[PDB]
Design a protein around this ligand. Structure first.
Ligand code: HC1
Ligand code: HC1
Ligand code: SF4
Ligand code: SF4
Ligand code: SF4
Ligand code: SF4
Ligand code: SF4
Ligand code: SF4
Ligand code: SF4
Ligand code: SF4
Ligand code: FES
Ligand code: FES
Lengths: 571, 571
C-alpha cells in the first residue's frame, strides 16, 4: 500500500500504485464514458471513447493507463468532447436503426451515450452494414447492430474457458462468428448465456415465446399453470425502480394472478422433492461405495459440458431430473388426474432466470413436459404491457396443494445452497436426530470463492466435499481429481460464476456490487421461513404416500430419472 | 354526491356519477395507455389507443365514456392487446426514425409505448411522411415526427385563447400549420411555450445554443459569467431522479463551477433592483394619480400580447426592464469597469425556464446585453455530458459581489410573488415602519385561482390590486377593466398558468400534482432565508451609492428603462 500524487481537474487525489486513471478519477465523482471495458475483463482499448488530455497535450486512453507521480489530467476540455462526438458520429453513421423494433430499447448503452453526448445531426452518410440473420436456437444474433467491442469473445475465452466464438474477416467487414457460420448447437457452445449478459447493444438477444402463451390463454379448452424460480423473487423488483435483493414474492404472485394464469405454484416444492431423491441416492451410493465422486445434475449447461468435453464422467452423474422437469411431470401426471383434466389440455409455463432451460425444455427425452419457458425480463415486459402497477400491489399467497415450501429450498439461487440443503437432509438421514440452533448453517461452504472445500464430520464419519462455481473452476477441479491428488464423495458444479443469481435471464444492472446484494437478499429470505429442512415438508409426504410410495421406486425411477448420452462429434 | 357501482376486471368499484372509465379504473392501480389526452384538456378521441371491451363484445374508448350502473369492463383481453399492437404498428409504419438524432430521445412517449406493448417487426412497409423543416425562431418544428394528436392546437385554443395554429389539409397529408406557412414571428404567436410543453413526440422542440457557449469558453481572451433563475433550483433535481420541489441550489452552483464558468451569480439581485425601481415608480404614479392602472413588464410574452392585440395599454405599462436584462446591463456596464475588462471581451449566459426569454434576448433595443440563453433541460444535458454526478456533490455558495440575495426575490417563480414583494417594499416606503411577525405574508394573494383580487389597507389608504395568471384570465380582466365596472391601481399578468414554474423550459413530468409540489418548495425556500425584504439588501445600496446615486435617476433612466412599440400589422 504505497500512495501516489496526481492532479485531476485541479483536485489532489490519493491512490495506490497501479490504479488506472479511470479508477482514480472515480473517487472524485467523475464518470468517464466507455463501451469496451467491464468489471470482469481486462482493458481492451477498442472504443477509444475514454480519452483524456494530459499536460503535454495528447489524447490518452484512461482505461489502461497506469498512474504516475506529478501527473496533470484534464477530462472535460473541448478537444476531448469534440473527439468523442466525432467517434460516436462515426459509429452511428453505419448503424441499422430500428430502435422501434429493438429488444434492447430503453436499455441500450449506445442510445444513452448518443443522448448524453449531444448528437443531433450526422454528417457522414453512406455505406452501412448489411448481413443475414439466422436462428441460433435460444440466442438471437443480429450482426447489423454490432459495434465490435469484443466483450462476448473476451468473456467466453478469459472467464468461461470454452472459446466457442472469435473474430472473423478484417477491416470494415469484420464480424463475430463460429467456424464456418455453423449453428451454435453443434459448435462448442454450452448455452450458459454470459455473452448475452454483457453485450452493450441489441446484437445479442433472446428468443421470445410470449405469443404462444397468449394464444394458449385465449384458448377456452386449456388450463394454464405457472411455476416461479427461487431467484426471480429477488431481482424482479429491480425492473420497477427498487434496489437489488428486495423481496417481491407477494407482489409478483398478485401480478401473475392478474395476468390471467389460472394456478400459480413455485418450484421449491420440486426442489425439496429433488433434495429427497438426491439424498437417498447419495446415501445408497455411500453404502455401496462405487462410482465416486458423484456430481449434481441441476445445471443444464454443466450437463452439456459433460456430454461434449468430458464424456467419461457420465456414469458418475446423478440421474435425478432438474426441479423444472420434475414439477412438469408432477403437474401433468398427478395433478391433472386429481383435478380431472386430460393430459393434452394442460399448459405449463415456467419463469426462469436461465438460458439453458430454454434449450433443456425441448429435449426429446422429456416427452414435452414443459410447453414454454420465460425469463425475468420477459415477465417484467408482460407486467408493464398489461398495465399493472407494481409498487402499490397487495400481497397474496401461492395456490394449493403444490405451493407450500420450506427454507432449505429457498437457497438454490446462490452457490453452495444445494450442498447445504443436501447436508442438512443427509445428517438427519444418517444419524436420526435433527440439527438445532446455529448448527443448521454450514458457514464453511458460503462465499464467492473459486473452489470451496470442506470436511463435515457426521458422528465420526468424515466426507470429502467440494463446490466449484464456474466452468473454468470446474475444469480445474476435474484436472485435480483425475490426476489422483485426492478423492471426494460429492461435488457441485454451476456454470455461472456466483450461482443462478448471475444468470443470463436476469435484469441488467450497473452497480458493481449486485452479487453481494442478491446473496444477502437470498440469505435473508431463507432466514425468515418457519421450516428449514426438506423432510419437514408436508405435501411431499402426501405425494409419496399416494402415488410413488417410496423414493427411488419403480414408478419414481420411471418418471423422476433420466439418462445421458455422449455428444462428442469426433472429427 | 351520488355513487355508481360497476365491475372492472372482476373488482367492484364505487365512483361518482360522470367519471369516465379511465378515471374509475385508475383507483384500482390500472394504467390504460393513451396519447391524445391530457389533464388540462377535454377528451378528443384521436389515438384510439385506450379501447376496452365491454360485456357486449365491442371496443369502446375509455377516455370519453361515462360510467353506468351494472357495467362489465375487460381491460387486458387478447383482442384489445392485438388492436393496440396493430394501431401502433400503423403509426410506426410512417415515422422518420432518427432516434439517435432526436432531441426527445429517452423522453418520448411513442418510444416508451413501442417498447412496452412489445413491437419487434413491422409488417407494413411503404410510403412515409416527407416534409421540409423551416426555422420558426426559438421553436423547432419537424412535421415528419407528428402523430396528429391535436394537443398543441387544443392547448392554444381552449386554454390560452390565442388560436395561432390549426389543422391544414386532410387525410394522410394532414399537418399543423400557420396561415400560409408563415413564420411564427409575424403570426399571432406570443412565444409562451405551452405547446412545446405538452407535445408527446419530438416534433416540437426548442433551439439550442450550446455550441456557441462551448466555442466562447475555449476562447482564451474572454470571461464568461452565468446567472440562474429563481425557479431553476426547485425543478433541476427532477432530471436526476429526485422529487419535485427539492432544493438543489448548492449542488447546481458546484456543478456550474465544475462546468468551466468563471463566475456564477444569481438573478435575485436584479430582482431586488427591479423591485426597488418598480416600487418607486408606483409610489410616484400614485402621488401623481395618472395613467391607471399600472401593469408589470417582467413577462416577455405579456409584452408581446400587449404589442400585438392591445396596443392602447402601452402608456400604462411599467418601463422597468426585466431582471435578466437589468443583470446583463449591470454586468457589462459596472462589473467590467471594476474588474478591468473591455465590454467586447465579456460573455453573459443565462439559465431560464422560459421560451420567451430566447426571443427577448435578441431584441434590437437591448444592444445585445445577453449573449446566450439556456434552459433547465439544456443545463441538465450539459451536466450529464460532462460526467458530474449530481447526488454526491458538495454544497457551495455564489460568487461576489453580486451573489447575495434576500427572501423577497425568491418567490418570483410562482404566481403572486411579485405583488407580495412589491407590497412588502411599498408598505415600508409609504409608512416608514417595518412589518414584523406573520404580517409579512399576504395570504389573500396566494393560491392557484384564475383571477385573484385583494384589498390591502396601508395606514388608512386602500389600494386595489389584481393578479391574473394566464392569457385567458388576462383578457377577461382587460374586458372587465375597459368597461368601467371597477378601477384598480396595480395589476400583475403572467402568460403561463401557475407562474414561471410551469414554463416551457422546465423538465417533463408525469405526476398530476407538480404545481402544488413546486409551489410548496418555492415557499419553503423563501421561508428559510435571513432577510425577507428588498430594501434590506446590502449590495443594492452600494450600487446606488457608487454608480446611479438615486432610483429613477438620469443614468438609471438611461440604462434601466425601455420603451415599447406597436406590432399590430394591419391587414
Ligand atoms: O432446475 C432447476 Fe434450479 O441448483 C437449478 O439449478 S435453482 Fe431454479 O433459483 C429454476 O427454475 C434457477 O435459476 S429451480 C434452476 O435453474
Ligand atoms: O426576467 C425575469 Fe423573471 O416575475 C420573470 O418573470 S422570475 Fe425568472 O423564476 C428568470 O430568469 C423566471 O422564470 S427572473 C423570469 O422569467
Ligand atoms: S453462451 Fe456461453 S459458451 Fe456459448 S458463446 Fe456465450 S459465453 Fe460462450
Ligand atoms: S456481439 Fe455484443 S458483446 Fe460481442 S462484440 Fe458484438 S457488441 Fe460486443
Ligand atoms: S442496439 Fe441500441 S442504438 Fe442500435 S437499434 Fe438497438 S437500441 Fe437502438
Ligand atoms: S448456474 Fe443456474 S443460471 Fe447458470 S446455467 Fe446453470 S442453471 Fe442456468
Ligand atoms: S407558443 Fe403559445 S401562442 Fe404560440 S403556438 Fe404555442 S401555445 Fe400558441
Ligand atoms: S405538433 Fe405535437 S402536440 Fe401538435 S399535433 Fe403534432 S404531436 Fe400533437
Ligand atoms: S419522436 Fe420519439 S419515436 Fe420519433 S424519432 Fe423522436 S424519440 Fe424516436
Ligand atoms: S410566466 Fe414566466 S415562464 Fe411563462 S412566459 Fe412569462 S416569463 Fe416565461
Ligand atoms: S473503455 Fe477505454 S478504450 Fe474502451
Ligand atoms: S386517450 Fe382515449 S382516444 Fe386517445
Amino acid at each position: 500500500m504505497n500512495m501516489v500524487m496526481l492532479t485531476i481537474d485541479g483536485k489532489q487525489v490519493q491512490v495506490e500504485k497501479g490504479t488506472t486513471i479511470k479508477k482514480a478519477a472515480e473517487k472524485l465523482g467523475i464518470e468517464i464514458p466507455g463501451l469496451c471495458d467491464d468489471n470482469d475483463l481486462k482493458p481492451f482499448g477498442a472504443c477509444r471513447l475514454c480519452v483524456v488530455e494530459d499536460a503535454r497535450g495528447n489524447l490518452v486512453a484512461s482505461c489502461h493507463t497506469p498512474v504516475r507521480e506529478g501527473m496533470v489530467v484534464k477530462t472535460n476540455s473541448p478537444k476531448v468532447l469534440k473527439a468523442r462526438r466525432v467517434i460516436l458520429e462515426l459509429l452511428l453513421s453505419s448503424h441499422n436503426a430500428d430502435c422501434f423494433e429493438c429488444d434492447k430499447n430503453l436499455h441500450c448503452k449506445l442510445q444513452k451515450y448518443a443522448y448524453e453526448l449531444n448528437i443531433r445531426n450526422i454528417r457522414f452518410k453512406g455505406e452501412k452494414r448489411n448481413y443475414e440473420i439466422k436462428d441460433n436456437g435460444p440466442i438471437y444474433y443480429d450482426p447489423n447492430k454490432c459495434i465490435l467491442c469484443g466483450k462476448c469473445v473476451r468473456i467466453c475465452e478469459e472467464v468461461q474457458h470454452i472459446c466457442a466464438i472469435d473474430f472473423a474477416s478484417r477491416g470494415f467487414k469484420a464480424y463475430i462468428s463460429t467456424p464456418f457460420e455453423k449453428p451454435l448447437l453443434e459448435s462448442d457452445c454450452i448455452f450458459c448465456g454470459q455473452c448475452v449478459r454483457v453485450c452493450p447493444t441489441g446484437a445479442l438477444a433472446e428468443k421470445t415465446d410470449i405469443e404462444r402463451i397468449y394464444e394458449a390463454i385465449s384458448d377456452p379448452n386449456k388450463v394454464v399453470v405457472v411455476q416461479v424460480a427461487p431467484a426471480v423473487r429477488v431481482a424482479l423488483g429491480e425492473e420497477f425502480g427498487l434496489e437489488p435483493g428486495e423481496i417481491v414474492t407477494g407482489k409478483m404472485v398478485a401480478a401473475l394472478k392478474r395476468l390471467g394464469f389460472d394456478k400459480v405454484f413455485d418450484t421449491q416444492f420440486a426442489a425439496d422433492m429433488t433434495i429427497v431423491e438426491e439424498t437417498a441416492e447419495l446415501v445408497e451410493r455411500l453404502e455401496k461405495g462405487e462410482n465416486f465422486p458423484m456430481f449434481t445434475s441441476c445445471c443444464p449447461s454443466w450437463i452439456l459440458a459433460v456430454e461434449k468435453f468430458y464424456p467419461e464422467l457420465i456414469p458418475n452423474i446423478s440421474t435425478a431430473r432438474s426441479p423444472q422437469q420434475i414439477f412438469g411431470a408432477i403437474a401433468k401426471n398427478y395433478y391433472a388426474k386429481k383435478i380431472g383434466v386430460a393430459r393434452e389440455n394442460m399448459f405449463v409455463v415456467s419463469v426462469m432466470p436461465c438460458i439453458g432451460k430454454k434449450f433443456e425444455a425441448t429435449r426429446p427425452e422429456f416427452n414435452n413436459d414443459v410447453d414454454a419457458v420465460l425469463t425475468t425480463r420477459e415477465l417484467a415486459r408482460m407486467i408493464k404491457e398489461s398495465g399493472i402497477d407494481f409498487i402499490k400491489l397487495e400481497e397474496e399467497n401461492f395456490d394449493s396443494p403444490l405451493g407450500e415450501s420450506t427454507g432449505a429450498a429457498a437457497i438454490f439461487g446462490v452457490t453452495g445452497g444445494v450442498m447445504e440443503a443436501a447436508l442438512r437432509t443427509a445428517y438427519s438421514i444418517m444419524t436420526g436426530e435433527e440439527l438445532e440452533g446455529d448448527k443448521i448453517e454450514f458457514t464453511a461452504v458460503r462465499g464467492l470463492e473459486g473452489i470451496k472445500e470442506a470436511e463435515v464430520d457426521i458422528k465420526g464419519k468424515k466426507v470429502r466435499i467440494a463446490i466449484a462455481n464456474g466452468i473454468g473452476n470446474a475444469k480445474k477441479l476435474i484436472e485435480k481429481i483425475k490426476s489422483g491428488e485426492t478423492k471426494y464423495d460429492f461435488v457441485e458444479v454451476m456454470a455461472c460464476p456466483g450461482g443462478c443469481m448471475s444468470g443470463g435471464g436476469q435484469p441488467y444492472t450497473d452497480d458493481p456490487e449486485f452479487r453481494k446484494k442478491r446473496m444477502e437478499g437470498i440469505y435473508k429470505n431463507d432466514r425468515n421461513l418457519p421450516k428449514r429442512k426438506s423432510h419437514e415438508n408436508e405435501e411431499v409426504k402426501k405425494v409419496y404416500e399416494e402415488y410413488y410410495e417410496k423414493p427411488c421406486g419403480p414408478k419414481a425411477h420411471e418418471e423422476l430419472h433420466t439418462h445421458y448420452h455422449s455428444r462428442k462429434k469426433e472429427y
